[PDB]
């Protein structure tokens, strides 16, 4: 479960 950025957005799994 991949998070991105300062808002920690949901982006992809694995």
């Amino acid at each position: 479960r991949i998070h991105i950025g300062p808002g920690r957005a949901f982006y992809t799994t694995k």
Partner: antibody
Amino acid sequence: EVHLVESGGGLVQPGGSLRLSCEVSGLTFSNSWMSWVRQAPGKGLEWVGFIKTKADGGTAAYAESVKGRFTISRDDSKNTVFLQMKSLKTEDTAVYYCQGAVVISHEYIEIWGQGALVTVSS
Amino acid sequence: SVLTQPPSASEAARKSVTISCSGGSSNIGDDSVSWYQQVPGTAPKLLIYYNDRRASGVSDRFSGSKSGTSASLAINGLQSEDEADYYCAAWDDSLSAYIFGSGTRLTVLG
């Protein structure tokens, strides 16, 4: 096309309280991960905290240096995220920026506001 | 536990620069690096996210890579617009906070 417009900046004495607003247009606010980063005069960048979408927790988390003095909250009705500050120190004097972020069609997008200056001083 | 960048960098117009960032396994190691550009006065702008993906509407002169516990932003066809501060950024696991690099002031010669 996207814009993040913040406000409520100003001057407030040590010990005081203050509320920043960030108003987001050109974005589905519902699905936007909102956060705040600050930059103290002549220094580097420091993350303040974020708030999740309603479809997740709706919950916020915070940098330890503001934990419990700062509250992030949001109003999906009014397309706006808030950064409530209480118990301010001089060390809190900075330009505060919010960020909006979505993920549409496997692509990430993160837009920043122009920032608002908060001066803590007597 | 901090992300460290060289303070300054420099190169001539039309050429290419590399800016590095080194963290530890708890931030860059475990997650992914993003890069920001900041021209003094203005706000920062996202350039790269998830190690190597380009932000919506950004010159392909910019590109990013991640090797192990370090990370690297590269810039081609160097224009004068391009001098700014550059910040890497990652989530850190032990601190539980989004952490930004020291920052690097690129200057363009010639």
